[PDB]
Amino acid sequence: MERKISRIHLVSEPSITHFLQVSWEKTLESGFVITLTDGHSAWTGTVSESEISQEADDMAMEKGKYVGELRKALLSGAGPADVYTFNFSKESCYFFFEKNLKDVSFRLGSFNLEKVENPAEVIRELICYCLDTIAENQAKNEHLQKENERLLRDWNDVQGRFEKCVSAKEALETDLYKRFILVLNEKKTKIRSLHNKLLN
Amino acid sequence: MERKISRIHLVSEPSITHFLQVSWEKTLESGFVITLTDGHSAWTGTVSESEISQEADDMAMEKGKYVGELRKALLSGAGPADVYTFNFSKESCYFFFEKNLKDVSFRLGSFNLEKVENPAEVIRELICYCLDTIAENQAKNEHLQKENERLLRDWNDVQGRFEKCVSAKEALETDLYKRFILVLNEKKTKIRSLHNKLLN
Amino acid sequence: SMFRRHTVYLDSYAVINDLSTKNEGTRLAIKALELRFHGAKVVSCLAEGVSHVIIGEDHSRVADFKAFRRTFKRKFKILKESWVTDSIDKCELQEENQYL
């Protein structure tokens, strides 16, 4: 049950910011429930797969592109240069959104929202969800920071150990030849003694 | 400048969960402004050095410990063994919270709140702050994930280098020892051959 | 060559005598690598030739090792990770009695 909260500025009331909450089960294509609130009143509407398909057919384009545009507009996924205008008639509870392009505009979508008798409940639910996600993200960040610190400490320790071992390698390389020389010299001294005894 | 938002359950109406936000400049010592919100109505109050000092004076307890309890209670710092009960008389707009330990109540504070004409702006500010916190937390999470991936890659590279170094050291030692032992066996055969002539 | 005559088996596998269950330990792998670097013999299969055993913070497998060593003709020793570190730091073989 994915959810996304965004802040928009209706053209009718540009002095205040409204909150649009879009909730979908698996993907935006299947359908989604949207809720527009302003801290005092809330309007909730639903869009199904049939409505999205009909809108895409009317606008005469592939479903994928329409879904991408809807994601960019409603979910606040707009690119560096993408202006979307949201209009909402409160008397008729008609909420539509369009894409502005230079001197032309495209009526991207429209829905008919209905008022909810208890905006307080939905406002409280939204605030509680926001607080819960904030807490979860904070806990995840703390855990990641702890893991990073542990990894850094272990990496430093292993680096020091490798620094010691790389020199120990050459130390052993040098020591082995000297040891071999000593033992071989002793054996050759025994050989010389035996040869002298034989000569005698 | 920072603030903390927590969920507060009123004894009168436990079914509905209110939201209490407390904001301060540098520390709770200087002061703090509190706001209680339900979704349709809101109340605001402030506390400064004089008020907190007066509230501490009537009780035989240290000011530092008292502000510690205030932080533990109002900022949602209560532990598993700590339980706090709050009351908000709407008719007199009188707020007070107590600690329930060992089945006995104990007053901690007594604040006076003033209703706000428009409760639609406080809720808007709360939601905007929550969204900003979510965004910054997500950015921090992404940065921490990138750092963790980099650290893991570095650790794996270091482990591989250590494995290569140890393998090379073992190979070098084995080769040197095989060469030395072969030379020593040659010397030993020479010694035995020379000694065999002693009996003759 | 201090660890030349001291073979060490490490609990880097959840199931003994099974190579498919290699663990992703952090300190354990490095300690095994250093021990093998210093001349110690590390065997992936626990055979009769094992003489020393090193176990990290995971104390769950202590009972399993204590049960296994009973059947073994020669009982090995379970030593903490501090023994090897102290040995490297002091450049000589510490007594295991202080780390058993």
**Could you write out the DSSP letters of every residue in B98-147?**
EE--SS---EEEEEE-EE-S-THHHHHHHHHHHHHHHHHHHHHHHHHHHH
Instruction: For chain B, list the strands marked E by DSSP.
Output: 2-9, 17-24, 31-37, 42-48, 84-89, 94-99, 107-112, 114-115
B165 vs A144, A165, A190: nearest CB: A165
Q: Looking at beta carbons, which residues of chain C come within 8 Å of A157?
A: 30
Report the alpha-carbon distance of residue B165 to residue A200 in Å, rounded.
53
Task: Using the CB atoms, write b or e for A17-29: b if 16+ within 10 Å.
Answer: ebbbbbebeeebb
List of residues 6+ apart from A5 with CB closer than 8 A = A19, A20, A21, A126, A130, B127, B131
Please name the chains neighbouring A, where neighbouring means 3+ C-beta pairs under 8 angstroms: B, C
Handedness of CA A35, A36, A39, A42 (dihedral sign): negative
Structure tokens at A78: 């707009």
Structure tokens at A60: 């005469």
Report chain B's terminal Cα–Cα distance, integer Å.
106
Task: Using the CB atoms, write b or e for C27-51: b if 16+ within 10 Å.
Answer: ebbbbbbbbbbbbbbbeeebeeebe
Instruction: Kindly identify which residue of chain B lies nearest to residue C41, measuring between CA atoms.
Output: B170
Resolution limit in angstroms?
Answer: 2.8
* Burial zone of B49 (CB within 10 Å; 0-12 exposed, 13-18 middle, 19+ buried): exposed
Q: How far is A141 from chain C (nearest CA, A)?
A: 22
Q: Looking at beta carbons, which residues of chain A come within 8 Å of B192?
A: none
Q: What is the residue whose two structure tokens read 């620094």? A: A163
Q: How far is A20 from chain B (nearest CA, A)?
A: 11
Report the alpha-carbon distance of residue B139 to residue B56 in Å, rounded.
41
CA distances to B113, C10, C53, C87 from C73, in Å: 80, 19, 15, 28
DSSP 8-state class, residue C50: -
Q: Looking at beta carbons, which residues of chain A come within 8 Å of B185?
A: none
Q: What is the dihedral of CA A85, A88, A94, A98, to 10 degrees?
A: 0
Report the alpha-carbon distance of residue A117 to residue A32 in Å, rounded.
21
Tell me whether residues B159 and C30 touch, CB distance under 8 A. yes
Q: Looking at beta carbons, which residues of chain B come within 8 Å of C37?
A: 165-166, 169
Structure tokens at A180: 């071999």
Number of B–C residue contacts, CB under 8 Å: 12
Q: What is the dihedral of CA A73, A74, A79, A85, to 10 degrees?
A: 50
- Pick the residue of C2, C3, C4, C30 with the most A CBs within 10 A to test the interface with A by mutation: C30
Contact B155/A154 with Cβ under 8 angstroms? yes
Q: Looking at beta carbons, which residues of chain A come within 8 Å of C27?
A: 154
Report the alpha-carbon distance of residue A87 to residue A70 in Å, rounded.
15
* HEC profile of A1-52: CEEEEEEECCCCCCCCCEEEEEEECCCCCCEEEEEEECCCCEEEEEEEHHHH
Contact C61/C51 with Cβ under 8 angstroms? no
Contact A36/A20 with Cβ under 8 angstroms? yes
- Which amino acid is located at B151 in the chain? L
- Which amino acid is located at A65 in the chain? K
Structure tokens at B62: 């240290």
Determine how β-strand C77-79 pairs with β-strand C52-54. parallel
Query: Where do the H-state alpha helices sit in chain C?
Result: 27-37, 62-71, 81-90
Report the alpha-carbon distance of residue A15 to residue A134 in Å, rounded.
28
- Which amino acid is located at A136 in the chain? E
* HEC profile of chain A: CEEEEEEECCCCCCCCCEEEEEEECCCCCCEEEEEEECCCCEEEEEEEHHHHHHHHHHHCCCHHHHHHHHHHHHCCCCCCCCEEEEEEECCCCEEEEEEEECCEEEEEEEEECEECCCHHHHHHHHHHHHHHHHHHHHHHHHHHHHHHHHHHHHHHHHHHHHHHHHHHHHHHHHHHHHHHHHHHHHHHHHHHHHHHHHHC
Q: Within an 8 Å CB–CB cutoff, is residue B148 touching chain A?
A: yes
Contact A21/A7 with Cβ under 8 angstroms? no
Q: Within an 8 Å CB–CB cutoff, is residue C4 touching chain A?
A: no
Identify the three-state secondary structure at position B82.
coil
CA distances to B12, C22, C83 from C63, in Å: 56, 20, 21
| Phi, psi torsion values for C68, nearest 5 degrees | -65, -45
Contact B94/B107 with Cβ under 8 angstroms? no
Q: Within an 8 Å CB–CB cutoff, is residue B166 touching chain C?
A: yes
Q: Within an 8 Å CB–CB cutoff, is residue B129 touching chain A?
A: no
| Residues β-bridged to residue C22 | C13
